[PDB]
Amino acid sequence: WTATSGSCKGRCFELQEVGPPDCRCDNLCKSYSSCCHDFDELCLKTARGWECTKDRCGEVRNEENACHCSEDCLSRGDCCTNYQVVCKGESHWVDDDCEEIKVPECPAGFVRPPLIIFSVDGFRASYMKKGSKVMPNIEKLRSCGTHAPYMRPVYPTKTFPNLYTLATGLYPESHGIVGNSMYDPVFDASFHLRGREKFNHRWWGGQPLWITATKQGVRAGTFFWSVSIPHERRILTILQWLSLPDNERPSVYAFYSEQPDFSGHKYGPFGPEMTNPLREIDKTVGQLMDGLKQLRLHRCVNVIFVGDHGMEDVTCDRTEFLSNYLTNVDDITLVPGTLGRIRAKSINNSKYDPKTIIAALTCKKPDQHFKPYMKQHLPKRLHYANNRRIEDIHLLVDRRWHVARKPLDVYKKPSGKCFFQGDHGFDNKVNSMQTVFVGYGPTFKYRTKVPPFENIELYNVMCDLLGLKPAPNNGTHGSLNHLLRTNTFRPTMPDEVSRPNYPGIMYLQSEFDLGCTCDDKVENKLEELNKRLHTKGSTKERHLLYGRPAVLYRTSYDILYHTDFESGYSEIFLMPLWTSYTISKQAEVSSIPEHLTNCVRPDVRVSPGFSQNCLAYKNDKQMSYGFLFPPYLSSSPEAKYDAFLVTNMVPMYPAFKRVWAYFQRVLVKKYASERNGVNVISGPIFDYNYDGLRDTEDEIKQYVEGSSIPVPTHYYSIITSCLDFTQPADKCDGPLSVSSFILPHRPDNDESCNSSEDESKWVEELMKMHTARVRDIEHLTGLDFYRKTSRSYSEILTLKTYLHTYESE
Ligand SMILES: *[C@@H]1O[C@H](CO)[C@@H](O[C@@H]2O[C@H](CO)[C@@H](O[C@@H]3O[C@H](CO[C@H]4O[C@H](CO)[C@@H](O)[C@H](O[C@H]5O[C@H](CO)[C@@H](O)[C@H](O)[C@@H]5O[C@H]5O[C@H](CO)[C@@H](O)[C@H](O)[C@@H]5O)[C@@H]4O)[C@@H](O)[C@H](O[C@H]4O[C@H](CO)[C@@H](O)[C@H](O)[C@@H]4O[C@H]4O[C@H](CO)[C@@H](O)[C@H](O)[C@@H]4O)[C@@H]3O)[C@H](O)[C@H]2NC(C)=O)[C@H](O)[C@H]1NC(C)=O
Ligand SMILES: COc1cc(Nc2nc3ccccc3n3cnnc23)cc(OC)c1
Ligand SMILES: [Ca+2]
Ligand SMILES: [Ca+2]
Ligand code: NA
Ligand code: NA
Ligand SMILES: [Zn+2]
Numbered sequence: 001w002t003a004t005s006g007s008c009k010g011r012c013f014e015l016q017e018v019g020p021p022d023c024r025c026d027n028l029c030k031s032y033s034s035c036c037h038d039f040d041e042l043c044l045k046t047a048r049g050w051e052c053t054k055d056r057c058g059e060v061r062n063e064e065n066a067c068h069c070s071e072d073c074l075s076r077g078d079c080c081t082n083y084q085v086v087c088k089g090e091s092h093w094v095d096d097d098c099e100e101i102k103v104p105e106c107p108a109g110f111v112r113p114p115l116i117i118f119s120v121d122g123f124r125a126s127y128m129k130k131g132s133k134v135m136p137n138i139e140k141l142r143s144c145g146t147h148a149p150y151m152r153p154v155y156p157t158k159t160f161p162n163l164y165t166l167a168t169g170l171y172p173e174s175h176g177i178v179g180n181s182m183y184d185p186v187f188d189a190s191f192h193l194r195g196r197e198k199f200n201h202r203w204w205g206g207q208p209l210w211i212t213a214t215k216q217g218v219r220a221g222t223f224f225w226s227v228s229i230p231h232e233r234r235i236l237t238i239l240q241w242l243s244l245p246d247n248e249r250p251s252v253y254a255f256y257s258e259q260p261d262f263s264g265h266k267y268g269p270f271g272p273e274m275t276n277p278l279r280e281i282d283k284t285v286g287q288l289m290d291g292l293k294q295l296r297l298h299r300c301v302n303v304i305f306v307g308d309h310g311m312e313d314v315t316c317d318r319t320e321f322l323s324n325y326l327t328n329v330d331d332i333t334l335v336p337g338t339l340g341r342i343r344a345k346s347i348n349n350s351k352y353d354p355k356t357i358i359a360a361l362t363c364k365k366p367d368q369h370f371k372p373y374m375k376q377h378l379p380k381r382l383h384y385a386n387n388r389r390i391e392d393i394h395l396l397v398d399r400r401w402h403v404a405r406k407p408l409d410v411y412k413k414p415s416g417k418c419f420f421q422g423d424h425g426f427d428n429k430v431n432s433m434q435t436v437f438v439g440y441g442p443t444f445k446y447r448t449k450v451p452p453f454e455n456i457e458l459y460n461v462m463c464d465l466l467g468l469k470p471a472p473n474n475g476t477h478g479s480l481n482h483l484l485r486t487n488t489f490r491p492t493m494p495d496e497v498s499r500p501n502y503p504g505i506m507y508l509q510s511e512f513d514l515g516c517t518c519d520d521k522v523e524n525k526l527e528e529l530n531k532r533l534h535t536k537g538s539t540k541e542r543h544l545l546y547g548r549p550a551v552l553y554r555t556s557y558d559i560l561y562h563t564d565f566e567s568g569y570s571e572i573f574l575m576p577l578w579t580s581y582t583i584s585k586q587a588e589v590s591s592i593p594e595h596l597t598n599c600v601r602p603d604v605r606v607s608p609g610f611s612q613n614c615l616a617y618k619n620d621k622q623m624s625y626g627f628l629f630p631p632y633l634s635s636s637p638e639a640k641y642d643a644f645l646v647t648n649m650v651p652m653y654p655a656f657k658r659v660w661a662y663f664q665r666v667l668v669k670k671y672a673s674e675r676n677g678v679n680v681i682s683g684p685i686f687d688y689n690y691d692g693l694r695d696t697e698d699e700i701k702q703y704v705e706g707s708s709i710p711v712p713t714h715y716y717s718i719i720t721s722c723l724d725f726t727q728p729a730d731k732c733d734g735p736l737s738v739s740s741f742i743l744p745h746r747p748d749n750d751e752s753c754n755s756s757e758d759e760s761k762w763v764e765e766l767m768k769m770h771t772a773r774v775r776d777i778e779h780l781t782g783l784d785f786y787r788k789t790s791r792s793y794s795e796i797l798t799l800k801t802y803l804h805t806y807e808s809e
Pocket of ligand 6: 750751752753754755
């Protein structure tokens with residue numbers, strides 16, 4: 001109940017929210033059906049429109065008008081935004097030459113430059129170039145300020161997950177808004193775009209920027225606008241708030257536009273109907289900038305122009321139907337569209353089985369346009385599993401497609417034809433899903449292009465712009481320092497927690513009873529000292545190029561040196577946490593010699609009690625083994641024996657060994673050829689609770705049969721070279737270049753529909769799907785890489801957030 005017979009007189013767009021049953025006058029009151037009776041009359045004036053004209057100049061104030069052109073309007077803070085242009089001979093902001101903003105130029109009483117976030121729903125990254133001729137104001141912000149060629153959204157590339165990621169710095173799995181539609185089994189409650197459940201605070205986790213600001217004494221505008229409030233009135237409202245006295249005036253503001261998304265769904269991303277929405281958004285930016293200029297704030301305010309996601313061509317004819325795959329289609333609930341989420345229709349149905357649903361959905365039709373996954377098997381870069389609101393069964397839908405349960409879901413009578421031509425929600429690496437970032441103002445750089453980055457990083461920067469301490473989030477604070485003129489965040493590297501042991505030769509061959517064998521008894525004062533030097537680390541500068549990784553948790557591990565590679569060997573997990581090696585452009589690939597095919601050699605530096613054993617693998621009929629440093633890339637026949645050390649062995653399903661052997665035998669050399677040498681760090685990952693974070697020992701769900709050898713959920717590699725590929729990886733003077741992956745360690749290759757073919761036809765495609773940031777691997781391993789370079793730490797942080805996407809231009 002709302003007692004709507006209170007009044008909005010002197011309260012229009014009030015900042016403090018009033019509790020029911022008192023009536024509201026704020027920018028969201030319409031959405032709750034709670035505005036006071038006179039809110040339209042007083043707060044939503046429209047008389048005479050939004051622009052001054054020649055004959056209104058100096059008019060007698062008329063309080064009915066939408067905006068004013070009277071002499072007093074500047075002191076009232078309510079002139080039409082073009083007032084000074086029409087009436088006082090001023091230029092529009094867009095027509096002024098751009099001039100560097102070296103220092104904030106703010107009116108007296110301003111404690112900090114205000115921040116305005118201008119959010120555009122569905123604004124695809126390529127609109128910045130493709131629409132630049134019809135967007136002069138946006139083009140001036142872009143060219144004069146700091147811009148990225150695109151900004152990567154989070155998955156799923158839907159509105160609420162992305163807007164809330166922008167506001168919190170959190171992945172959707174952590175902030176809880178995991179789709180535009182959700183079911184929470186604990187609450188037993190459903191969240192939808194339409195309706196009232198979405199306003200309940202229990203859906204919304206983390207700490208969004210407006211709350212962070214308010215807790216730390218920085219006042220915030222109310223960020224959200226009821227859809228029927230016209231854009232011109234949103235802008236006027238912001239400009240009016242900026243005229244409040246110092247003690248009452250917010251420092252952070254948000255504008256939101258439902259366009260170009262609204263038209264993009266109807267017309268497709270590049271429909272000819274899309275030009276008009278882009279022109280209208282540009283005109284709104286112009287209104288805001290003209291308004292700031294009138295207030296003498298256009299060289300004071302930092303403006304962020306940012307989108308939530310892009311838009312792809314999707315039509316209802318490109319829909320896959322689960323009714324063509326599943327017998328039991330009425331026993332499932334599907335969240336449909338550009339992603340699929342499946343769960344049981346009834347929790348009372350004990351005949352429901354996820355295994356049989358996955359199998360019925362796996363590689364069934366030659367050109368199938370979706371792929372099913374248990375959520376823990378989704379690419380780790382999506383960070384889309386650790387939330388009870390994410391159903392166990394997920395469908396990744398190809399770009400340009402939909403999935404639905406049955407045909408009747410997609411049509412309506414009489415004709416059955418559908419309407420829409422655009423949609424979004426697909427994999428956040430998809431080019432059509434990318435969106436925009438421009439920052440303009442005193443705190444941003446002048447005429448500066450920055451590389452693409454992820455929207456999870458922006459919360460930290462917005463906090464920096466406002467002098468706030470960010471709440472704990474998934475950005476990497478400092479990774480976007482290069483966007484900023486000042487207010488940089490200068491982090492220090494994390495302290496190492498565990499120091500390594502450096503074991504020497506401590507065990508005789510006969511102390512080992514591991515059940516391994518090797519044909520290695522091939523029996524020189526010259527060369528003996530040489531092998532001893534290798535074991536003490538004489539080649540370590542070649543193979544460990546950026547320092548040893550730091551171990552950021554408590555554990556016992558050993559550094560092991562060899563001719564061709566260095567490793568950090570965990571006595572707890574019985575295998576390396578990391579193995580590091582450099583392959584120059586000139587390196588040659590060799591075979592595993594016949595006499596060494598099944599060779600595994602005790603490591604006399606490591607106790608039998610802290611070693612794997614071969615008997616366990618013999619007895620585990622499902623599990624085989626591979627090596628982290630690959631024997632194919634040994635520097636000589638003699639160094640090759642080091643590769644068969646039991647301390648270089650890791651458990652691998654035979655299906656996985658197909659993938660790994662091809663990576664090691666073919667792809668590493670290919671990358672060294674193309675990149676002029678590579679440095680490779682490889683290792684295991686254990687994430688059995690799919691939280692994106694390193695498992696402790698007591699979280700491990702699977703061991704090699706009969707043993708304490710834990711089975712990795714994933715294997716990673718980090719592949720580093722010189723950004724200037726005219727320098728070899730091992731003699732690089734400047735910035736680095738990286739690509740990495742986190743490959744799921746699966747007992748089958750059911751994910752790759754073409755796996756019965758030669759690895760040259762499917763393995764690299766798999767690895768691209770599982771591309772990763774170094775930071776992703778850091779979270780999953782508790783290691784900290786690139787500790788010793790010649791590069792600045794913020795530059796390294798940017799490198800650690802890089803994702804190599806394998807998407808064309
Ligand atoms: C991305 O960045 C984020 C933010 O930094 C990282 O997330 C953090 O990760 C931490 C580790 O997973 C986690 O720390 C835990 O906090 C628990 C208290 O949590 C509440 O309080 C915080 C602080 O205000 C709040 O933010 C939380 O919010 C979550 O939950 C609410 C309500 O459900 C949601 O609205 C919200 O969306 C958010 O949900 C997300 O996180 C939770 C986990 O907290 C998930 O379950 C959800 O799926 C979703 O992803 C909470 O309201 C605290 O209880 C934990 O301590 C337990 O574990 C330790 C181990 O050290 C143990 O020693 C303790 O005894 C305790 O165990 C007891 O409970 C166990 C489980 O019930 C039980 O098994 C034991 O036997 C014990 O009884 C823990 O410290 C932190 O909460 C989140 N923060 C957020 C915002 O998500 C995230 O990791 C980053 N991601 C990557 C990939 O890097
Ligand atoms: C959800 O979390 C955030 C929301 C917004 N804003 C808005 N999101 C909308 C989403 C759908 C429909 C209308 C919407 N709207 C209208 N007026 N403002 C908004 C901004 C956020 O950060 C700057 C974070
Ligand atoms: Ca959107
Ligand atoms: Ca984990
Ligand atoms: Na075996
Ligand atoms: Na297959
Ligand atoms: Zn949309």
